[PDB]
């Protein structure tokens, strides 16, 4: 069967709006289970540096008891049915999701009603969550990848609320109080900025009725008439390096500014990442991998690993690479990476563009398997693009690219640009800004 009607037979996401502006989206499948979640676009971009650890510590406190269900009641109600409860918070989103069976759908929508609306906070609970979140920051300090991405976010978005981390600093955690969490939850948890998403064996009318029963109490009116607007952040080409020579391996991330969510060009840039790919020391391909950077990394024994990333935020983003390697290769590997980027400016052919198109097709269909990633895609699509883009539209956008437009978008976004460099480990051979900036343009043209 041809891929087009294979994509067409996937059911469409159904989206409805309540009276308060709350968005309700559901996707039906043949599965016996379901995943129901709440997505609120309230992250560290909206925190004004007096509440830098508000969202992370609030989602720490969200499952420790509500108003009607104190302490062990909600966890006993959600664990007696075998449901799994998860939450996370990015720099622009905040998600509370539950995986459960299809029978217990009124129970799960009632629980997601009373978690995000009637959360109860207490002094012993807030102090024990304070020492828990301090120990969690202490144990997350030793993972080098999160440190390098936090350094890159700090040095790429200086003077803007996109630099500050999701967890926040230790001083703001030590100085946070009940009233800051209360009014942050009051001004940031509003119905027009809320999506209730569901994926799996779900009836849309039943969940719409239950959402009208439970989620129709939001107090969406501006209490202080303070509209939180999205200030456009500026990408600053800079370089942060954390030299510490007792670490065994060095992590270096190099990233230029991305277009954003609304620009379709990142889709083309996605194909560019599918040209460059990724490599680990545990890959079974060996030497004959199609990516030239991976082949020269295994052929010359350069890296422990490298990975190409494209993070997108509202009107901005970071597109680049991250590699962990020993010290004595770092400079050399940087050169190879830059050469590959400039190949995407000039020597893009039909073969690697077609291979990147096929890899991106397999990535965007294979990721949306199971209820949880489909529900995640639904929530992030209704929060970022404002609608759920169908996968046939993704295929139509993927098929439209060729080597000419891929190489001119790569010349638009990589050629003669100022990158952002973050490093951690034995990074003495990591070059200055001048060598990297000179290497991000060829002299032959």
């Amino acid at each position: 069967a041809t891929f087009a009607q294979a994509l067409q037979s996937v059911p469409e996401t159904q989206v409805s709006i309540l009276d308060n502006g709350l968005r309700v989206a559901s996707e039906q499948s043949s599965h016996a289970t379901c995943t129901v979640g709440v997505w609120i676009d309230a992250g560290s971009r909206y925190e004004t540096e007096k509440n830098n650890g508000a969202g992370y510590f609030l989602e720490h406190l969200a499952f420790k008891g509500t108003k009607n269900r104190p302490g062990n009641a909600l966890e006993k109600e959600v664990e007696s049915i075998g449901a799994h409860l998860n939450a996370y918070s990015t720099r622009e989103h905040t998600a509370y999701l539950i995986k459960a069976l299809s029978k217990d759908l009124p129970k799960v929508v009632e629980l997601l009603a009373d978690i995000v609306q009637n959360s109860s906070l207490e002094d012993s609970q807030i102090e024990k969550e304070r020492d828990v979140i301090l120990r969690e920051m202490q144990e997350n300090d030793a993972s080098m990848q999160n440190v390098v991405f936090d350094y890159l976010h700090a040095t790429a978005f200086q003077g803007t609320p996109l630099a500050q981390a999701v967890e926040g600093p230790s001083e703001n955690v030590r100085r946070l109080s009940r009233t800051d969490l209360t009014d942050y939850l009051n001004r940031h948890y509003k119905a027009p900025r809320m999506v209730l998403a569901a994926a799996g064996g779900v009836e849309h009318q039943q969940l719409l009725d239950l959402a009208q029963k439970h989620l129709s109490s939001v107090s969406r009116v501006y209490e202080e008439d303070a509209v939180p607007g999205l200030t456009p952040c500026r990408f600053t080409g800079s370089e942060i390096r954390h030299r510490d020579d007792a670490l065994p391996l060095a992590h270096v991330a190099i990233a230029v500014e991305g277009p954003g969510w609304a620009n379709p060009d990142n889709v083309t840039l996605q194909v560019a990442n599918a040209i460059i790919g990724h490599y680990d020391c545990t890959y079974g391909g060996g030497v004959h991998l199609s990516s030239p950077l991976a082949s020269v990394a295994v052929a010359n024994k350069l890296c422990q690993s490298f990975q190409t990333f494209n993070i997108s935020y509202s009107d901005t983003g970071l597109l680049g690479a991250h590699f962990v390697c020993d010290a004595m290769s770092i400079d050399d590997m940087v050169f190879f990476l830059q050469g590959q980027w400039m190949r995407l400016c000039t020597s893009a052919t039909e073969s690697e563009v077609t291979r990147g198109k096929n890899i991106l097709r397999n990535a965007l269909v294979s990721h949306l398997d199971g209820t949880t990633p489909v529900c995640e895609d639904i929530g992030r699509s209704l929060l970022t693009y404002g609608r759920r883009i169908p996968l046939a539209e993704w295929e139509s956008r993927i098929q439209e690219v060729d080597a000419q437009m891929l190489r001119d978008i790569c010349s638009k976004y990589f050629y003669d640009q100022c990158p952002a460099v973050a490093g951690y480990g034995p990074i003495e051979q990591l070059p200055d800004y001048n060598r990297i900036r000179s290497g991000m343009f060829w002299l032959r043209f």
Binding site: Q138, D141, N146, D150, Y151, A154, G159, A163, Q164
Partner: peptide, 15 residues
């Protein structure tokens, strides 16, 4: 904590 650090203000040098 690695979240305790942030870049200094480069306002006197930036354009």
């Amino acid at each position: 904590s690695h979240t305790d650090v942030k870049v200094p203000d480069f306002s006197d040098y930036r354009r």
